[model samples]
Target: TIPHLAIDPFSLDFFDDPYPDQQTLRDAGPVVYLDKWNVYGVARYAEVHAVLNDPTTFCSSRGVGLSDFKKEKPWRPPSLILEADPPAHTRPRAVLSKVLSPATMKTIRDGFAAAADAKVDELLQRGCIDAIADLAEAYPLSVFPDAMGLKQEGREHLLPYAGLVFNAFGPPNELRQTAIERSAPHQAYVNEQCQRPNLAPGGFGACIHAFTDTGEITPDEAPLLVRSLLSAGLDTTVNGIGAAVYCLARFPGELQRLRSDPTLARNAFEEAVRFESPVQTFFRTTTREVELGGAVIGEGEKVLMFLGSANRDPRRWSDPDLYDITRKTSGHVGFGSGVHMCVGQLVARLEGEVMLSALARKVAAIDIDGPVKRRFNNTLRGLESLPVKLTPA
Candidate 1:
């Protein structure tokens, strides 16, 4: 029998300070049955990593949510890549892999770099700014939509839509309902933008459409795949940047280390991701009864993978909680692992690299100025407000 706990991972309090409970879950056993949600929780590094990589047993096609899609209707159309498995996931994954490949990234890196430099210059002029609003959120919003060739109008809808999509991955709660209620317009706008004519000729959105021409995927599948990009692309990157800023502000020595070796900007971003996992939890259902940590979980049971917890598991790192930019963060589950790993992580890394590198060249120091406010989502961990004062070099 699995160790059962009544802890509610989706509660507001849990979202506020999850580490204590995370530690408890890890200590309880490798697999704990979350009584409140009736899901098996995988909180340790080894198990979480194993489950993610073993998508055959811990499948995503059943839906990566607490509410199983087979039993209940999905809140929205499922993500083509994020919620898919194996053969069904192959072609879409291939197209996206091609779309965001290193060579493809070269086309956008210069643009992203230019935008990051300009955004940092603007923020530096302010001196004291809400890093979440000013730098973290602003930088991505400026570059991503234009890259996708989305129309300038109604681009503001992206964040709310992303929030809704992520929130729906959890149980049906007020937060999920509110996100659903508020996201109708945003969803409509995203649907409109995914259309072929709306996309810019040389952009990623257009590139996805081109896959249809080659008979890779159907015309009808094109927009949904583009929709997949719109859903996964924005908020994760935004929160990632927020995490980086918050980590740097809290640990000035790390910031100094980054400044000393300007090349450490990418490393700094990755370290922040490990230290503060932006996407905290993801659900993978068991395809068949499997033994984990000596417990036999039944087929089709919801298995919650505590990504944030696993990333900070002491078993995985010498000093897990430390915000050390120099640490080799290669094996960290921040961007996840296996075939189901984040498809857009390269873009997120580029955004982080360019932005942090620009700041390293221009800003001497980053220190928190006021109280930090946390943004609570069922699966995403991030800051809503990060008051920071930057010193110009």
Candidate 2:
């Protein structure tokens, strides 16, 4: 049996850049019990991989956040699929999965690249912009809403609503409070767009509703599933693109390598996922009694999987701190693993390719204009400000 070890998941030190504490957790062995939160933690790649894959033993149904979904004040219902396991999770996952097939991604591929190029060209005129709010936010804000078939007025709420949803997944704090206040005004439109006729024909939202008609999923679960896509698919790529651009900009030699060979964009994007996992940490529930290193984890406890830590864990990655585009990074959990792994990862990859490839073609180099700042939240390790000099080719 594992003795209870006290570690607060929300302490300021863990939030203000968690790498140091993550290192300590990794060394402390697997399944460290955080008595304050009544959760178990598995810090290394191997341990996290096991936890993520073994849904029966370490389930998602309990709630991926620090609190139980029934008790927690979620803005809306929990994600029917992302928050469920097995039979309960299957139909919705299947319903949405069909809509996001490789063929669909292939269809959108060229257009996404074209859109990204146009945005880069537009931003290049200024030669410098906050990569976060300007370029990163712009691309997804342009494509994803239209792809979801949302009208422009309702679509305006995408970022803030998603920003709030991610915050809501964590313990209620100042950040969560601020995000909820920001999103409260737009909640109605978000709910309205989840209905059957609200989406444009031949779009992801509409297709999700069709699943209900076909008896593939319960009618009640449709809106929650569609909302999941919106929450997970939107700001994530936006921030990810911002972070990737920042990486290429920060590391000149790597930038030159990519510029010389555009094909490197895929590997570079994967490498960036490994180097700076944009969607930082998410929680997992332990469904069985298990031992990690020397400790025993009681059933029904929570485990916060630090994807960022696993990405940079020294034990699993050689020269883990360095950001090399060419690393063989297949096992990286930046997009997560197991059944509930990010379903829209292909969409994310397309977006990254677009932005990185465009920068590779247009920019000679990138230079930092000021200090970079990382915002601390329950989830998502994001850049609040990325001041840069976009040297055009």
Candidate 3:
């Protein structure tokens, strides 16, 4: 029995590369308390999956953060969608799920592909570009705003906003501070775009508003729900895009394979998700005394589930450290699992498939230089810079 064991987990070093640290924790036991954040971390795949799925036993209503929703320094209203459980989480999920059904994703495919092609053309035209900034970041920013029916006004704030939100999930580290300071100016503008009238027609946000109009969700709950989309939808795709580019740049042979067989674009995205899970960790509060991996988690206790670490766990993956787009990865937890699994995953997939497919078609080869600078966040594995050379069509 690992009794009240604790470790300092908020150190700066852990954020840059946490796999080794998480490996250490999982080796010790499934559940270990992090004294710095005062949260128990579930490091193994079995324990992580158990908690993310059993939201009833491991309720998310208390908010998925280190600070207890009851006593914390007032961290805004919880997403009635993401922070909810059972009846509460079920209904909104259904409503949004309907809006984002596979059929709807199929409907948006043509538009997404067009956007991806155009962006790839623009990037390739320049001959050399930063993959993170010019390709991965640019592609999604264009497609998502269009899909959500959001006007172009504050779209520039998307990445910064998400970066801050993801970082806010962790401690008040330099990462958190940097993001907060960067986004403070435009915070209100971002929030304001969630209203019914504010959403553009035929956008995801507008569709959400339409759901509210039909009483699918209350008018009041609309913004926070949309806020969930904005909060999570942006930076995740950005990081994923960066990670995908990073993987291809580092693994040159893989890029050529993807270029030769353009279909490898989607597989490459999945590979990147498996390798550098964009959303790293999320908190799940124990609703009752639940036993996971021989560890008893008490009620009201917060458990940090390392989804990113579990994706790379030796127990689940073969050669867990290697980046292979061809490897089977349908079961990966990069988008999470169970009910709280990312609702906008399809939108992200579209962005990924579109851009990569287009880039493979146009660019004959890619050249990368300089070390990839990583951005630290409690929740996201983001890149600050990924320089690359793109051969023109």
Candidate 4:
């Protein structure tokens, strides 16, 4: 029998400091029932990896949230990529994978790199700045939209919409409701932006729609697919950059090492993802009774994977909590795993690598200017403001 944990993973307190209870769940067993959300929670690296890898047994189509699609209708039509299963997930995945292909990354590199250089130069001018607001949020908010062909007028809606989407993954608590209530206009703008009329001639949005011409997807299906990009892409990248900045600032040695060898920027950004997973928990519903760590969770049960905890699981790493930029983080599930892994990851990596590499090349030190103000969200782990003073090299 799986033990029942009273812990509320979505609680503000939990978000404030998730580590202690993360340890509790990991030590308890491979799968423990969460009383608050009434879903089984898996925190260990082995179990979390297993659950994400074996998608056939642990499904996503029945809603990757507290609510089950089989029992209740979702507030919005489900994500074509995120919430779809294998056969359904395959084409959309292929369509998007092609849109964000390595070729696409090379195409975006110059713009992304130049922007990173200019942004870093601007931040260094101020010396002291809010890394989350002025740097992390600022960088992606500027570049990613341009890549997606978003108009400047409604671009402010992206973060709130992403916050709402991520919050909805948990139960319909105050955070989720408040996000929804405050995000009506944001939601409308995002939904409208998905249509082909608003997209740029040669942006990622147009690329997804182009798949429609080839009969890979239909015109009606194109907007939802675009919505998939708008919904999942922006905020996650913001959090990822934020994660790297926070890691670098906290570990001065890592920053120094990065400054010495800018080539480590890719691994540094990757290691930071493993150290502090920006996209934390993701839910998967069971298709069959599965045995894990000597426990059996019946079919159709909601299984929540504590991805951040898995990254920090000692069994998986030699010094799990240490933020080492040189650490090999190939197997981390920060961007998830299997065929359902993040389609826009190349875009995010390009952004992260550019920003960190550019910053490392131009800046001598990343000094923490003040206490970091953590941005509390149900699923996304990031800062509201990270005060830092960058010294010119």
Candidate 5:
């Protein structure tokens, strides 16, 4: 069954707190026609999971954003990996998978830990800092770009570029319109940064470029793949770490749990991901007329999947809202699912685990120091500022 709801999910009020409307949408029915956008939305976990797992019927080729590629043009070149389907998707995925395989990333484990330790040491000296500005945003910018072999001069544009990219996933609202107006130079910087010769030797970007030599990806597709990695790595990981820090700062008991048994660091990060889903909504176009929870979604119809809602769906977990670090979170859709699961997830986990582990090892508490400011984006959820005091252990 379906219900028509007249809710503007893009409103400022909705951005401030989305859960209430999310619950209403979840309760409206398994499938609801969002009158505001003329699109269908699926909020419950079961339906969300079902749609994501069946990519043939629900595809990404029409674009993951609300603007269907079938009728509308993307803001820029669409993501080779994210906006592509199978066959077309297979080659780049394989190239990126091989480039970012755990074996290769594992080699940088010590470096990641060292970076985290160095940052923790600096923060402990300062005693007070914005976790979002310094730790969440700074940490990834410091490590991931280096990992990608990007030069130092233009690294500042990465966040703005990433913000613009995520904002484009939603409707052409004011947020996207304003971002696009001011986005040209930043976008150009990202484009230039993705080129092969601009990359440093032995870095991930160079490694991606190397695939072109083997005929795995063409020379032109190589830069786009690099751009895909750039888009995948920055803002999502920043928001993810911020989400974890926000959780630990608010839930001291969980922090103690993590501190007592340092092994819980990975699980803690994962639980935070499930609890505060940084990447919120993504749209999948129905490839053919498909049945979703007894309701039919016609071919080319757009269904916005609320991943954050699905992660907190009552049907899937006991006390879905509870942030239990020890709980098993294997099936959470925070990173999406099936073939299109986040390509940069391991990198994000590595950043989260290293930073949280260092904090647990060297810090006694994460005290919320000031009013937190939320960064509003069309599809991502995270704080713009989270001031905190780091009491040294």
Candidate 6:
């Protein structure tokens, strides 16, 4: 029999600081049943990796949240790519795979790099700044919306919209409830922007809409696919940059290492992701009866994979908790794995590499100036405010 723990993974306490609870869940057993949520938790790297790899056996279509889509109406229409499975998942995945390929990213690389350099120059002039607001959020907000070919009027709504989508993955607790309340206006704005006429020529949003002409996806599915970019692209990178700045500030030696070898900018970004996973947990429903670590999970049972815990699992990596840029982080679950891995990972890497490289070249050092504030969502982990004083090289 599996150990039954009464831990509420969705509680405010857990979200505020999850390391202890993550360790407890991982140490309890390979698989533990959470009596509070009535969901099985997989906290170890091996099991979490296994669950992510076997999407056929452990599915994603039934809603990657506490709410089962089969049993309840979704908060919104299901994501064409994120919430789908197999044959249904094929066409949208192909379209997105092509749209976000390395070749496609090459087209926008210089533009993104220029934006990053401009942002860094502005931040350097300030000397003392909130990294989250000034650099992390500003960089993504500056480039991504334009790349999507959206108008500049209601761009403020992007972060709130991403917050709501991520929070909806958890139970309808206070966090999810509050996010839903604030996201309505932004949601409407995003929907309006997804219309074909609203998209700019030669932008990613326009490219997704063009797929409709090729019969790759239906006309109705085109907007929803654009909605996917709005939901996944922004906050993930914003928080990822925040995590990197936080890591480098706390570990100044790593920053020094980065300054000495600016080529390690990409490695620094990846190490930060492994050290602090921006997207923490996602639920997967079992396709059928399956035995995992001596326990059998029935079909349709929701198994929560703790990506954060798995990233820091000692069983998987040496010095898992340390923030070292040199560690081989290829297998980290920060962006997840298998068919459901983040589609915008290359774009994210470009953003991180550009910003970190700019900082390495222009800023001499980053020192934490005050207490850091963390922003809590059910699924995403990021800093709300990170005060720092930068010394220019």
Q: Please give the CA lDDT of all the candidate structures.
A: 0.90, 0.80, 0.79, 0.90, 0.90, 0.91
Clashing pairs in 6: none
Instruction: Report the lDDT of model 5 for residue 257.
Output: 90
Clash-forming residue pairs, model 3? 148-203, 148-204, 149-203
Pairs with steric clashes in candidate 2: 2-296, 362-393
- Model 4, stretches more than 4 Å misplaced? none
Model 4 lDDT per residue over 6-70, tens place:
98889889989988988898998888988877778899999999888998998899988888988
Every model's TM-score: 0.98, 0.93, 0.94, 0.98, 0.98, 0.98
Error of 3 at 317 (Å): 0.3
Candidate 3 RMSD to the correct structure:
2.0
- Residues 191-268, model 5: lDDT tens digits: 898998899999999999999888888899999999998777899999999999999999999999989998899889
> What is the C-alpha lDDT profile of model 6 across 72-102, one tens digit per residue?
8999999989999988998899898888899
Clashing pairs in 1: none
Error of 1 at 113 (Å): 1.1
Clashing pairs in 4: none
TM-score, cand. 4: 0.98
Name the weakest run of 10 consecutive residues (lDDT summed) in model 2. 68-77
Candidate 6 weakest ten by summed lDDT: 6-15
Q: Compute the lDDT of residue 150 as modeled in candidate 6.
A: 91
| Clashes found in each candidate (C-alpha, N, C closer than 3 A) | 0, 2, 3, 0, 0, 0
Candidate 4 lDDT score at position 316: 93
- Residue ranges of candidate 6 with Cα displaced over 4 Å: none
Candidate 1 vs candidate 2: the lDDT winner is 1
As for candidate 5, its clashing pairs are: none
